[PDB]
């Protein structure tokens, strides 16, 4: 129940505002900046502000914070969802999120803001569907918005029917300073770029553990996803009945399904790091990285971020394989490796200077983060079984899919 | 299939070597298609196994079945899930329609000795589907 959706800037200037209910005066935006400054300066800064009886709940974008004032007991989750939808629409329409487009795309921005939400209740949020009614360079609205299928425009025709899938893996590992892993969660991500003719009804099929158990084949390699979240095109009833994933893919790249389950396997990379930091004299970085992943897989662009001392200067690196660079902006040792064969072992010996004068305040212990991205590797063992592309006209589809394994929340706690 | 013919003798020898009773990761061949085995493909594989021999009358074992499924997947790209048998006790029919191979007693269904027996009626009659309609959906 947002009262007015407004967009501010880094200097507190409201780039664009769009009142929805009008129950809040437009002059309350002035106190938002001082309130945010006070909250941040006292540790009480939160995305949901409160100017007396009016609450300013908003998130920070790339260049401006989309703060939306509200007065009643509106759904904060609904406001956040509307803000996320607006951000996604802006990203789809504008390739960049900065002040250069707010002052240059106001003609289309105002129309999009007016059409998206009326009286604080949004009605349309599909960028592809909205692109047929609001353009910056107007006919009747398409029947897709009025029809049930609001994510697949009818009448789309293409020379070929090629759909590219992306089985993106996110390896998140939370290794404590004692050497044990606390949080090891792997979240699957099946992103497909559907480009076909008509309105095909995709019928995705995989070797799911639940599906295998229901069919009676619960003995082969099946992915046991704790959480499986289908997209808007995925029918909830079909998945709830017999694990049937039947939905109409949209025109373009979109997120269809996102598996999420815990992982009980050993880490694909084992990092043995040592810190021989002398008292204001010198420091040693005996970092050894062992690849526990399969030897047939190569981790392209391995980036093991090693947090070095903040005041360290005049450093020397004694490594084995991979480029090691210290970035003063980041204040860490970037263990950059181009290609890492599975089972490889990289040993490094850090040596950097330290000032005699001690630091005035503590800086903490940032965790060591690895940025390994090994494609063509499926740690979870989930493999796509079938993809039923059915069209009324009748055509031979050529679906495609790729499996990419990368490091997600793969942070290692320091000692 | 020259590759299938070549792999049949080695697969049979490996199955015979394994008695009837180390690397992590799941590497995938780049560009190799992966899909479930079809009824026609299963029938052709059963006919080839019957003609070449080594599968009919062989003692059924979990290790031998796993090795055969892995070899079939490597040589054809078929997932090792269509080589399933109906629960016992007694004669177990193939789970995938079109398969001409079945397990029959040779003497708890787990301790019962089973051997692979050719059955041409499997490719035409869905014995496994009739026995377990719920499993077939």
């Amino acid at each position: 129940s947002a009262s007015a959706v407004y967009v501010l800037d880094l200097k507190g200037k409201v780039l664009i505002c769009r009142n929805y209910r009008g129950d809040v005066d437009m002059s309350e935006v002035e106190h938002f900046m001082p309130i945010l400054m006070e909250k941040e300066e006292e540790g009480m800064l939160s995305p949901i502000l409160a100017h007396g009886g009016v609450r300013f709940m908003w998130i920070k974008h790339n260049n401006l914070y989309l703060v939306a004032t509200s007065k009643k007991n509106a759904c904060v989750s609904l406001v956040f969802s509307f803000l996320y939808k607006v951000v996604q629409v802006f990203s789809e329409y504008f390739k960049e999120l900065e002040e250069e487009s707010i002052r240059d795309n106001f003609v289309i921005i105002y129309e999009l803001l007016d059409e998206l939400m009326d009286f604080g209740y949004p009605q349309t949020t599909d960028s592809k569907i909205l692109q047929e009614y609001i353009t910056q360079e107007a006919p009747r609205p398409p029947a897709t918005v009025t029809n049930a299928v609001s994510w697949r425009s009818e009448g789309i025709k293409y020379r070929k029917n090629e759909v590219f899938l992306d089985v993106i893996e996110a390896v998140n590992l939370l290794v404590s300073a004692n050497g044990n892993v606390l949080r090891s969660e792997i979240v699957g991500s099946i992103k497909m770029r559907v480009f076909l003719s008509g309105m095909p009804e995709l019928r995705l099929g995989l070797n799911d553990k639940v599906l295998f158990d229901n069919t009676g084949r619960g003995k082969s390699k099946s992915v046991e996803l704790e959480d499986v979240k289908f997209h808007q095109c995925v029918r909830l009833s079909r998945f709830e009945n017999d694990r049937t994933i039947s939905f109409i893919p949209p025109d373009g790249e979109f997120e269809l399904m996102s598996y999420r389950l815990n992982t009980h396997v050993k880490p694909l990379i084992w990092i043995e790091s040592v810190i021989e930091k002398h008292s204001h004299s010198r420091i040693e970085y005996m970092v050894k990285a062992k690849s526990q992943f399969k030897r047939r897989s190569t981790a392209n662009n391995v980036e093991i971020h090693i947090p070095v001392p903040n005041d360290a200067d005049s450093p020397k690196f004694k490594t084995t394989v991979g480029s090691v660079k210290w970035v003063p902006e980041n204040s860490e040792i970037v263990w950059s490796v181009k290609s890492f064969p599975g089972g490889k072992e990289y040993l490094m010996r850090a040596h950097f200077g330290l000032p005699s004068v001690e630091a005035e305040d503590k800086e903490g212990k940032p965790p060591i983060s690895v940025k390994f991205e090994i494609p063509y590797f499926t740690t979870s063992g989930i493999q796509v079984r079938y993809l039923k592309i059915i069209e009324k006209s009748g055509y031979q589809a050529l679906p495609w899919v790729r499996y990419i394994t990368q490091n997600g929340d793969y942070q290692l706690r320091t000692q | 299939s020259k590759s299938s013919v070549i792999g049949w003798p080695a697969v049979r020898e490996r199955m015979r070597r394994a008695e009837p009773a180390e690397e992590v990761g799941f590497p995938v061949t780049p560009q190799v298609p992966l899909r479930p085995m079809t009824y026609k493909a299963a029938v052709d594989l059963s006919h080839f196994l019957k003609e070449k021999g080594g599968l009919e009358g062989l003692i059924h074992s979990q290790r031998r079945q796993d090795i055969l499924d892995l070899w079939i997947y490597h040589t054809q790209g078929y997932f090792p899930d269509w080589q399933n048998y109906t629960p016992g006790p007694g004669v177990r029919y193939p789970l995938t329609f079109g398969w001409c191979y079945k397990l029959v007693p040779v003497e708890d269904p787990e301790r019962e000795v089973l051997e692979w027996r050719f059955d041409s009626r499997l490719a035409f009659h869905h014995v496994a589907r009739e026995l377990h309609p719920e499993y077939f959906k």
């Binding site: 993809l387 039923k388 679906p399 | 190799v32 479930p36 085995m37 077939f136």
Partner: peptide
């Protein structure tokens, strides 16, 4: 080719499950 794993064709349905 493409970084992150070469694209592979997918099947149509579970042929072994009827």
């Amino acid at each position: 080719d493409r970084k992150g794993g070469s694209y592979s064709q997918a099947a149509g349905s579970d042929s072994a499950q009827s």
